[PDB]
């Protein structure tokens, strides 16, 4: 009775925190996507999720290796998709640019430049005098109206293959056998600390690799109420991740009937230039309902006072400054990259007691994704008029330091790091490593 | 082990249950430890290799302890009270396998070596016994 | 057999199930041995072979037939799966012919084997705890 013997149990439900190589699974329902989902394993039509009763686990959205893995995978997929496309080395020449003044509104004055240049032909000994339309953000004056592409002194842009599509397709991150992904089912989880309600899954839900800076688009909404998540709320140097419980529709359009012109710059190589806008020229913009935006901002303020006080003045101000990729709501809509001036959104002060907002947006063709210097991409023009409708699922806010008895707190939008876009979705997931082998004492003894 | 009257059995389902209760669901975890150029393809290959490695790591340990093909396998290694002085009821009724792993982690390697040595001794003794026929 | 003309991989593919059952090791011993994309493809092939072998071994284990070429089970044979006589199965058809017949009912048999092994393991555990 007092003699106990080691008993070996196989399959005991034990696990440890671990970092593994998560592979991708995509819905087979949907070979011309930047995210090569055709190489992803088909997903289970009926995903299996097991409720881990009595299990409390420690999550930390701000130290999740899943976010780093997704960032690396997205960058690698981007580079791989850009590998076979045309390299625009010949495009780095002197351009004789002149203003486009053919039915242009006052706002869209000086934004488009009509650039003519000498370009290499399919024959190495012949050159062609061609012209193209370049946005003012892409050309730089040489110092006659002589210009050059913005990237010519940093790198050679690789033209994006026109067939390849940039549309985000949901990606399910699956863990290998012997590993499990624990999902925090708590509806009020703030990204850190224990999660009383936990469940184990083998693949995450479909996470769209949506790339944006100030507004989180097409994300997943909070189930109960707006959720403010920050690594350290007191610290003012840490971004604040806001998740909406109801989406805010944003309507972005490019009211220019763009024309795509194909220029043969070599044997089997074509450069797609902007020929001529058919009709009038108007600025690109995005619309958000004033009432809906005000309601969501009020909810955000209400949930913000929980961390600052019921009697504090919460005011929203536009971005402090920096490069256009951080001070504007950057995003890609139908293959054309927008940079919207979200000054009309974050402009208000909230004391402790029909129409729509039009956001003027600028467009670029030379794109420096992932904050990488020396590796740019040229987005070919998109023929026709562009119009996409998205949901503002969340925000990436930043507070202002220098309290000194601050009865008021100022929050401004802030993008920059793209991991915050993934982190907003992988906050409830963590990868664990199973330990099926266990040894415990029992009165049983091996028979000889 | 056959789940008579079980509400539901699933992978890691009895993770919060006591060791005694979670010991009747070993089959649930055991059967899911093996089944479940492009950037994705390399990741899938690495995942498959990792799964095979992890499965075989435990299978080898089971094999060299004489517990091959068993979910619960009794051994001849007496339990040293130094490893854990808790009563049998204090372990199988007021503790979960996750808690237990955190207690005997320091003594896991000592136990494994003892199990391997005991299995080797058993094999040698069986060989000697059969040699007498 | 005791004295055979020649034993080779799949050599007994045409012999009756009774005769082909004496050459299981012949097939069992050949199920595992046999920068660039060629290296990656070769690695995938080798990993696939390993995974298939391990899946077969796990299936045997969860049925209680670990490390056995011929393993008897507690699952009775349902005549719905096949109504052929014992003599007319083991002396008048080959494994290839047999597989084509019970292909539909294979997963049912696998599930029954797994559940029967679960029951046997419960009985073993209960008897052990009784003592």
């Amino acid at each position, epitope marked *: 009775a007092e003699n106990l013997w080691v008993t070996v149990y196989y399959g005991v439900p034990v696990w440890k925190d671990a970092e593994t190589t998560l592979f991708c699974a995509s819905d087979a329902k949907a070979k011309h996507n930047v995210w090569a989902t055709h190489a992803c394993v088909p997903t289970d*039509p*009926n*995903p*299996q*999720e*097991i*409720h881990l*009763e009595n299990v409390t686990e420690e999550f930390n959205m701000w130290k999740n290796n899943m976010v780093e893995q997704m960032h690396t995978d997205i960058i690698s997929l981007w580079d791989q998709s850009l590998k076979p496309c045309v390299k625009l080395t010949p495009l780095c020449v002197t351009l004789q640019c002149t203003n486009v003044t053919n039915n242009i509104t006052d706002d869209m004055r000086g934004e488009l430049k009509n650039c003519s240049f000498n370009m290499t032909t399919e024959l190495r000994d012949k050159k062609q005098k061609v012209y193209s339309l370049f946005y003012r953000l892409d050309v730089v004056q040489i110092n006659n109206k002589e210009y050059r592409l913005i990237n010519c002194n940093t790198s050679a842009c690789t033209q994006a293959c026109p067939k390849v599509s940039f549309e985000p397709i949901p990606i399910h991150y699956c863990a290998p056998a012997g590993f499990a992904i624990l999902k925090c*089912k708590d509806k009020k989880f703030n990204g850190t600390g224990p999660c009383p*309600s936990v469940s184990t899954v083998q693949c995450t839900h479909g996470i769209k690799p949506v790339v944006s800076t100030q507004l989180l688009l097409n994300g997943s909404l909070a189930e109960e109420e707006v959720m403010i998540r920050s690594e350290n709320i007191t610290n003012n140097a840490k971004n604040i991740l806001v998740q909406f419980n109801t989406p805010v529709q944003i309507n972005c359009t490019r009211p220019n009937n763009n024309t795509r012109k194909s220029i043969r710059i070599g044997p089997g190589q074509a450069f797609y230039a902007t020929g001529d806008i058919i009709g009038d020229i108007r600025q690109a913009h995005c619309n958000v309902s004033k009432a809906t935006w005000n309601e969501t901002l009020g909810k955000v303020v209400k949930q913000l006072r929980k961390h600052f006080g019921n009697n504090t003045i919460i005011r929203f101000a536009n971005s402090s400054g920096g490069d256009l990729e951080v001070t504007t709501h950057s995003f890609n809509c139908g293959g054309e990259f927008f940079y919207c001036n979200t000054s009309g959104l974050f402009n208000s002060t909230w004391i402790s007691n029909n129409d729509s907002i039009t956001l003027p947006c600028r467009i670029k063709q030379i794109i420096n994704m992932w904050q990488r210097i020396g590796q740019c991409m040229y987005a070919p023009p998109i023929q026709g008029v562009i119009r996409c409708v998205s949901n503002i699922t969340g925000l990436i806010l930043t507070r202002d330091g220098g309290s000194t008895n601050s009865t008021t707190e100022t929050f401004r939008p802030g993008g920059g790091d793209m991991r915050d876009n993934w982190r907003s979705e992988l906050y409830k997931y963590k990868v664990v490593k199973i330990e099926p082998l266990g040894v415990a004492p029992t009165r049983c003894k091996r028979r000889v | 082990a*056959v*789940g*008579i*009257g*079980a*509400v*539901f*059995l*699933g992978f890691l389902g*009895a993770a919060g*249950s*006591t060791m*005694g*209760a979670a010991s009747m669901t070993l*089959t*649930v975890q055991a059967r899911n430890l093996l089944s479940g150029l492009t950037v994705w393809g390399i990741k899938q290959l690495q995942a498959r290799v990792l799964a095979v490695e992890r499965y075989l790591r435990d299978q080898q340990l089971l094999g060299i302890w004489g517990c091959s093909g068993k979910l619960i396998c009794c051994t001849n290694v007496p339990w040293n009270s130094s490893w854990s002085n808790r009563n049998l009821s204090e372990i199988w009724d007021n503790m979960t396998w996750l808690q237990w792993d955190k207690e005997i982690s320091n003594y896991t390697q000592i136990i494994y070596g003892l199990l391997e040595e005991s299995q080797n001794q058993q094999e040698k003794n069986e060989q000697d016994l059969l040699a007498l026929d | 057999g005791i004295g055979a003309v020649f034993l080779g991989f799949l050599g007994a593919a045409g012999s009756t199930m009774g005769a082909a059952s004496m050459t299981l090791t012949v097939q069992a011993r050949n199920l595992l041995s046999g920068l660039t994309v060629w290296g990656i493809k070769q690695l995938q092939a080798r990993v696939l072979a390993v995974e298939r072998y391990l899946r077969d071994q796990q299936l045997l284990g969860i049925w209680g037939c670990s490390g056995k070429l011929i393993c008897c089970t507690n699952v009775p044979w349902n005549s719905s799966w096949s109504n052929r006589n014992l003599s007319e199965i083991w002396d008048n058809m080959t494994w290839l012919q047999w597989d084509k017949e019970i292909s539909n009912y294979t997963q049912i048999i696998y*599930g029954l084997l*797994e*559940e029967s092994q*679960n029951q046997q393991e419960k009985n073993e555990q209960d008897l052990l705890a009784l003592d």
Partner: antibody
Framework: EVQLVESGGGLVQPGGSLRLSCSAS????????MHWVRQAPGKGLEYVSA????????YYADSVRGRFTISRDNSKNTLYLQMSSLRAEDTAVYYC?????????????????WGQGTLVTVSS | EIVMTQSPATLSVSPGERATLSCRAS??????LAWYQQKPGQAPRLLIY???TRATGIPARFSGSGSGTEFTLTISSLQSEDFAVYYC?????????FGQGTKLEIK
């Protein structure tokens, strides 16, 4: 024929305690799990708690976890639900429910027979 | 938590015709769907389990079909006693969730 009869429901003040009982007959009580399902007035059926065949494992909904206590007595074929610190939203009709079957390789938490159910009111 | 949506909220069909009730799940629940009938002031009664199998003692006129995300219950020959609230329940992911009910009204 399987009979499940509830009892104990009634009027209880908020923050009080209440115990329900469900006498089960016509089947092997210890071989099947038991669930408690409540239907608040003007609402659909809601899961409250469940208990395994032998009572070793008990499950609770998030709303009731930490306040309710499900238990069974296989000897007398009875299922109990002890409620404590009841609230206004806890008022509903509680059905003692028998799980259909038990499976080790799939999910089978559907219900063959439901008890009549008892009305529990929380008010001051 | 999988959400089961029942449409229409209330359905009116005269006796003798076919009545179709639709239940939709937020995520695929495979065949793990069950149908319950609850007469007023009476305990719910299981009709279909597995989305296609009929519970013992259930009239053959009750037919359920569907798999994955879409499921339907068909009552080929409605009768007077076939008046009740019909609930769909998934038993694929714990906790099991019920439909909001489809009040059937005799026309």
């Amino acid at each position: 024929e399987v009979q499940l009869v509830e009892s104990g429901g009634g009027l209880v003040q908020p923050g009080g305690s209440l115990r329900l009982s469900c006498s089960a007959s016509g089947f092997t009580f210890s071989s099947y799990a038991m669930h408690w399902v409540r239907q608040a007035p003007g609402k659909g059926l809601e899961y409250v708690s469940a208990i395994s065949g032998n009572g070793d494992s008990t499950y609770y909904a998030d709303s009731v976890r930490g306040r309710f206590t499900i238990s069974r007595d296989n000897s007398k074929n009875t299922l109990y639900l002890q409620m404590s610190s009841l609230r206004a939203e806890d008022t509903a009709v509680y059905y003692c429910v028998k799980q259909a079957a038990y499976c080790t390789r799939t999910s089978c938490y559907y219900f063959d027979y439901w008890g009549q159910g008892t009305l529990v009111t929380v008010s001051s | 938590e999988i959400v089961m949506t029942q449409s229409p909220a209330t359905l009116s069909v005269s006796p003798g015709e076919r009545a179709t009730l639709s239940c939709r799940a937020s995520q695929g629940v495979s065949s793990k769907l069950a149908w319950y009938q609850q007469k007023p002031g009476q305990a719910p009664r299981l009709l279909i389990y597995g989305a296609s199998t009929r519970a013992t003692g259930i009239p053959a006129r009750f037919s359920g079909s569907g798999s994955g995300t879409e499921f339907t219950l068909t009552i080929s020959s409605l009768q007077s006693e076939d008046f009740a609230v019909y609930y769909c329940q998934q038993y694929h992911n714990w906790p099991y969730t019920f439909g909001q009910g489809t009040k059937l009204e005799i026309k």
